[PDB]
Amino acid sequence: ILQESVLNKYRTAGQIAQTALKYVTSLINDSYHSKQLTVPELCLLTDSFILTRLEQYYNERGIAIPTTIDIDQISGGWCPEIDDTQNLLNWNKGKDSTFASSVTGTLRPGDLVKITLGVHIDGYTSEVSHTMVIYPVDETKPILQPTGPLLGGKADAVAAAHIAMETVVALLACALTPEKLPASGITGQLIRTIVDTIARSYNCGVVPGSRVRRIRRFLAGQNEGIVAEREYKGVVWTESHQEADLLSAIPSDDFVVQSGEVYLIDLKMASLEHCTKKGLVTLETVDSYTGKSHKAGELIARPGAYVRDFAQTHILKLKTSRQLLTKIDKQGVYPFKLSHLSSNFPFVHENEEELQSLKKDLKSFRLGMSEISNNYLCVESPIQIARWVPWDHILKATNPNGNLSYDATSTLTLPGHELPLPKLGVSAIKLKSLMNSTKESISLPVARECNTIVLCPELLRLTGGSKTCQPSWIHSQHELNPQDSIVQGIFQLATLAKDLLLKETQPMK
Amino acid sequence: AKQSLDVSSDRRKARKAYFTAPSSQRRVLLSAPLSKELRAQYGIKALPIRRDDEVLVVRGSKKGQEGKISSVYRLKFAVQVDKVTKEKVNGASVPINLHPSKLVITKLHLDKDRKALIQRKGGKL
């Protein structure tokens, strides 16, 4: 229940995330836009910062989400270590120019950087993310605001992200008042309707992983793909909903939002300026195996985050593995890196010798994690790229057994027994086969926006704000079709929010 | 009738040759006739089938259907066309295995070797 103890913990967990977001957005402008840090160097510095901040205030407390920096195709999972930088090169050495940013660590111009992170205190957690964008510099200008706005489909994506974010914020604010809503009381039906029509206006589809949901203590949705739950009220937009919208558990009907509750928003929009046609938007995993295929568009990598399934137990033969398991289970149920578990990781002072100390510890931790993973104690949080499939291949396909195809050597089970589209009787395995079975291997760029809110009378928005996620000014088109019900409602909502009360937590200096 | 010593009228030898024919000979065995329009167009009665050829059925229960070939299963002595499938109630579709002697071609997939084959067999193109 929303006690003072609960909500001030939420606040002090949130604004740490806010100031760390400011730190990263600081550093990236320092590095690229200003007169050069790589992705994995940003990540552990951000986590060091967050823990150094956490120490001052406050027993279970730490990083829910390790800071993830997706670039231009990846829906989620990219957050590598310093161990893996040469490995990424000598794996992707023969591939082509795409994914050069994520491979090398140096970011390019026009590169759509989706940052995300989160922090938790006693199970009360706050996630946040922001799609920012790189654009080259002005040199003749004195102040050098960097030159050019964005124009294309990525601009579409950013616009849809921000607009969907503000609209759902306002909707969940009107959840307090059964009034101050255009009748054009609140339901996942309405939420999915307004966000889908925004996506359709901007020609940017919703990604399967996106959601809006309730939160409770220790139960946020940090994983959302591995661990299960019976009591989960919230909305998702996956391939089943895509096919249903083309036609015409997570129940959406018996769901009306109430006072005194904490919610997570997480929206992912994949742009369509090419593609030519109607088609599906699904996800494909990234493995470390160069040898499964010959094509150059594929990315080869190793995920850094893990999560451990405390239900299972197995004595290890290996001292290093058992010590690392001690270090793990003394942490919590949230995902983690190997760098988080170490002796010198927060970097009270920072030099090269401490990074070297961390690297040696990492060399031991990978050996421990080998045995901890060969037994099914810990699993990887997968790296997922958005990939497009036209309906032509799917409808012309041949699936000799539908609703019965497992994938049988997928290790997690829950991404195995999925059945994304029950109609047409195709499963994830045959969908992967069809996605690969075509020279229309079109991968989409994606934009991401994540916030945490709580309903008391005001909407207390524990993340976001204008300091945080002010958008990179851009130049998009398809800017919001008027002459419909829902668009009138959305504009009335945006005007009426200026009076509804939205409190917003500021970052820490 | 037969007027050569090279060749045999032996059922056993002929059946053995058919059933142990390699793929290079199964290509020419699995030949399809052309429609009257394509016959007037080119000046040729038949061709060996291939993958991207649009085709039409004229015999069997799946008659009057048409589509482009999705596979040529030389091992099974058949071809797999799309839009001809036995759909099970769950959602599964299996292709019907057709023989190209029944099929008739409506449109071809033309490249240099196929053009040369037609010019060789006496096609005005």
């Binding site: 083309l246 036609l247 309906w391 032509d392 047409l424 | 099970k88 109630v89």
Partner: peptide
């Protein structure tokens, strides 16, 4: 023959 009907409707929607 439900897959027949839903594929027919889906062809209808994607062709236009």
């Amino acid at each position: 023959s439900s897959l027949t009907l839903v594929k027919e409707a889906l062809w209808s929607v994607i062709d236009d």
